[PDB]
Tab-separated table of C-alpha atoms and ligand atoms in Angstrom:
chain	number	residue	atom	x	y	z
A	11	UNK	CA	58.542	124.469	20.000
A	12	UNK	CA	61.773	123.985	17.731
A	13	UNK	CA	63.821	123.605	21.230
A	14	UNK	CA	61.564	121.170	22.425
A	15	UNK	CA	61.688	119.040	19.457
A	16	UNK	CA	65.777	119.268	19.058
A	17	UNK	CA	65.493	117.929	22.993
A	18	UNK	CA	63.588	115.030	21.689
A	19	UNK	CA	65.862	114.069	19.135
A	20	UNK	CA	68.329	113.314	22.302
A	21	UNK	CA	66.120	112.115	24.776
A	22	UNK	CA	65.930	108.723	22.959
A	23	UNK	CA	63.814	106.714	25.203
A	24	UNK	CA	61.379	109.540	26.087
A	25	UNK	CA	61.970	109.892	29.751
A	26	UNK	CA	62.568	113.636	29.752
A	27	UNK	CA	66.014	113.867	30.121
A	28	UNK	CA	69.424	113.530	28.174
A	29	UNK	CA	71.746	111.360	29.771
A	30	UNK	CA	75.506	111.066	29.058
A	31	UNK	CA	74.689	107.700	26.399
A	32	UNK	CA	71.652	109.291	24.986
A	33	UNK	CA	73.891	112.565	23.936
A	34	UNK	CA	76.999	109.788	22.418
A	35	UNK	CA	74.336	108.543	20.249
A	36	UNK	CA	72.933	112.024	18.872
A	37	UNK	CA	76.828	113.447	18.645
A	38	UNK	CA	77.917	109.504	16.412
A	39	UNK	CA	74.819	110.352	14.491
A	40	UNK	CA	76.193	113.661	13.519
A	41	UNK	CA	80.074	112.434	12.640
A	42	UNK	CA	81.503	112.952	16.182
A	43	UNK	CA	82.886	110.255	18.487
A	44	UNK	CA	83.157	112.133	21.348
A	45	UNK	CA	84.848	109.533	24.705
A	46	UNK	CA	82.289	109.235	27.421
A	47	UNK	CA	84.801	111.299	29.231
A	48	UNK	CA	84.134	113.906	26.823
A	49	UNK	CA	80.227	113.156	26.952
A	50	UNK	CA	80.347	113.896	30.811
A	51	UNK	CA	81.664	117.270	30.083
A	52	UNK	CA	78.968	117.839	28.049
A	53	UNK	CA	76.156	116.931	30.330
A	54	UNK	CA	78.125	118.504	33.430
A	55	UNK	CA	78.176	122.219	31.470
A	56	UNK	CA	74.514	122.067	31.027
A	57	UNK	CA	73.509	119.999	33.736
A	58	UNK	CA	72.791	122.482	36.153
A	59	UNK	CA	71.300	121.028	39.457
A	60	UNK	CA	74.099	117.950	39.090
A	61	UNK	CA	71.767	115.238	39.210
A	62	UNK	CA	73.317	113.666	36.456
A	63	UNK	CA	71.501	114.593	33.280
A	64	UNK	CA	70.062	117.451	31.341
A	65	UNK	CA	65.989	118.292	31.596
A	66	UNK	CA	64.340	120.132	29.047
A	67	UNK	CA	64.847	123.375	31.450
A	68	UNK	CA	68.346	122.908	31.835
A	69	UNK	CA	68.073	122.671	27.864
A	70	UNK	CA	66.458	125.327	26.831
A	71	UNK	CA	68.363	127.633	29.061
A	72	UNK	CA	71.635	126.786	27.634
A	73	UNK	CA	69.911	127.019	24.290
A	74	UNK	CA	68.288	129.968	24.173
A	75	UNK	CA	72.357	131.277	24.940
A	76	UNK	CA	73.772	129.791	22.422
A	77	UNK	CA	71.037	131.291	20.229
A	78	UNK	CA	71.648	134.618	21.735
A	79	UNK	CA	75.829	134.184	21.238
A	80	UNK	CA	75.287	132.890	17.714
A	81	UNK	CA	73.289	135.697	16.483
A	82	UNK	CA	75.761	137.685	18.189
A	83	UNK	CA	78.669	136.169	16.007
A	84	UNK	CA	76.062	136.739	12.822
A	85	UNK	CA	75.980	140.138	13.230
A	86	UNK	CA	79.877	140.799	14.014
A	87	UNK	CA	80.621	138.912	10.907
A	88	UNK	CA	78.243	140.777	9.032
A	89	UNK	CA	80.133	144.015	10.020
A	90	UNK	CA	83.438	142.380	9.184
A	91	UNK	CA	82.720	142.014	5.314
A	92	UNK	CA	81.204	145.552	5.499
A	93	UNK	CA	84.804	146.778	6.621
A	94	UNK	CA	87.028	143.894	4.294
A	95	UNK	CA	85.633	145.048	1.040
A	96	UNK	CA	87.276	142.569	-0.826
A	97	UNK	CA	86.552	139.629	1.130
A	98	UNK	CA	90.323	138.375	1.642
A	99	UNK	CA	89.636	138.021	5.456
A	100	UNK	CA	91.750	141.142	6.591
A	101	UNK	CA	90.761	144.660	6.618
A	102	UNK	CA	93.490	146.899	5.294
A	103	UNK	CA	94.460	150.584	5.917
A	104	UNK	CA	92.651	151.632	2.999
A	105	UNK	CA	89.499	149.503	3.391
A	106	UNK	CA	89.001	151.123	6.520
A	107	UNK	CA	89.929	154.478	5.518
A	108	UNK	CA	87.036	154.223	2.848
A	109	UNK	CA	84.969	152.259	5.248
A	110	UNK	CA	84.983	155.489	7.147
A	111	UNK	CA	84.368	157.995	4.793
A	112	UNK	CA	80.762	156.333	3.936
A	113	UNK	CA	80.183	156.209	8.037
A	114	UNK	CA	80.754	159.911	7.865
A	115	UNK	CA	84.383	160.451	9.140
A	116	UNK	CA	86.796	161.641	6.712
A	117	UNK	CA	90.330	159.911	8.379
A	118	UNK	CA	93.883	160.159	6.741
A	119	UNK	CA	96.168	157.801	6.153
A	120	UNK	CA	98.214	158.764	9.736
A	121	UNK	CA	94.486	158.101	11.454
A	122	UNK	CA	93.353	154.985	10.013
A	123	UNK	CA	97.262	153.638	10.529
A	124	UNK	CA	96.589	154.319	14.580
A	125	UNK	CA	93.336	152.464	14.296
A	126	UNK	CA	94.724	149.449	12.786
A	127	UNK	CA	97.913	149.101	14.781
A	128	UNK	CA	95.515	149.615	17.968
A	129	UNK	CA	94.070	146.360	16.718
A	130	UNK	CA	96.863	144.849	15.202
A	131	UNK	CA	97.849	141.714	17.384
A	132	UNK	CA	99.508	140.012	14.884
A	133	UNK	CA	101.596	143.266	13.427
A	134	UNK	CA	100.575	142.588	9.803
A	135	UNK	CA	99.538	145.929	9.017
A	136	UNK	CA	95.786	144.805	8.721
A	137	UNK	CA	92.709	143.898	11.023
A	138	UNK	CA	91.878	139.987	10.939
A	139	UNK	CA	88.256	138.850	12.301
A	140	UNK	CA	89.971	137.850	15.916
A	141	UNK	CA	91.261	141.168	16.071
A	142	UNK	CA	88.393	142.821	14.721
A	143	UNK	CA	86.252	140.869	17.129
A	144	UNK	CA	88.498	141.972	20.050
A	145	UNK	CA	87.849	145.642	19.399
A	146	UNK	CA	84.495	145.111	18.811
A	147	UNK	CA	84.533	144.264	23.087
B	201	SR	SR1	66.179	109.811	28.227
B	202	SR	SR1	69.679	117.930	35.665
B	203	SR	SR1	90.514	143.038	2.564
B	204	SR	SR1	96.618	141.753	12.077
């Protein structure tokens, strides 16, 4: 019922479908300027039987994924602050280390180093939310 009525916020004249114009005028309306060429790429990623616009089928689909990949994200960013303890957007050697100890493993320093340099992309000595993310896969 909410998808349907997010649809008819872009299908401005009522016709039951979203066409390339119909989308510039939702994405202005939200501070975006987006070049047509860019509002064809739009429409052609969710536009899947390539007739040119999006249907409320073709809509819901796509957002019914994005719901699925956003609450996704929620949840691996809710696990992130759980491990960064102090919230500076890296988990350290000792954040984990104590991170651990409450999930029932009791790791030394030599451990938790392994597990951070397994995930350390960037060689700073500390897990950042890409790198958290990738281990997480
Ligand atoms: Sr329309
Ligand atoms: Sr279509
Ligand atoms: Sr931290
Ligand atoms: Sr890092």
């Amino acid at each position: 019922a909410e998808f349907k009525e997010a649809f008819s916020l872009f299908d401005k004249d009522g016709d039951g479908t979203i066409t390339t114009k119909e989308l510039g005028t939702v994405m202005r309306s939200l501070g975006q300027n987006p070049t047509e060429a860019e509002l064809q790429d739009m429409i052609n990623e969710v536009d899947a039987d390539g007739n040119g616009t999006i249907d409320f089928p073709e809509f819901l689909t796509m957002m019914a994924r994005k719901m699925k990949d956003t609450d996704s994200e929620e949840e691996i960013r809710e696990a992130f602050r759980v491990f960064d303890k102090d919230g500076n957007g890296y988990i350290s050697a000792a954040e984990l280390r104590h991170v651990m100890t409450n999930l029932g493993e009791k790791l030394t320093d030599e451990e938790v180093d392994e597990m951070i340099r397994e995930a350390d992309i960037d060689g700073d000595g500390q897990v950042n939310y890409e790198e958290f993310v990738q281990m997480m896969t």
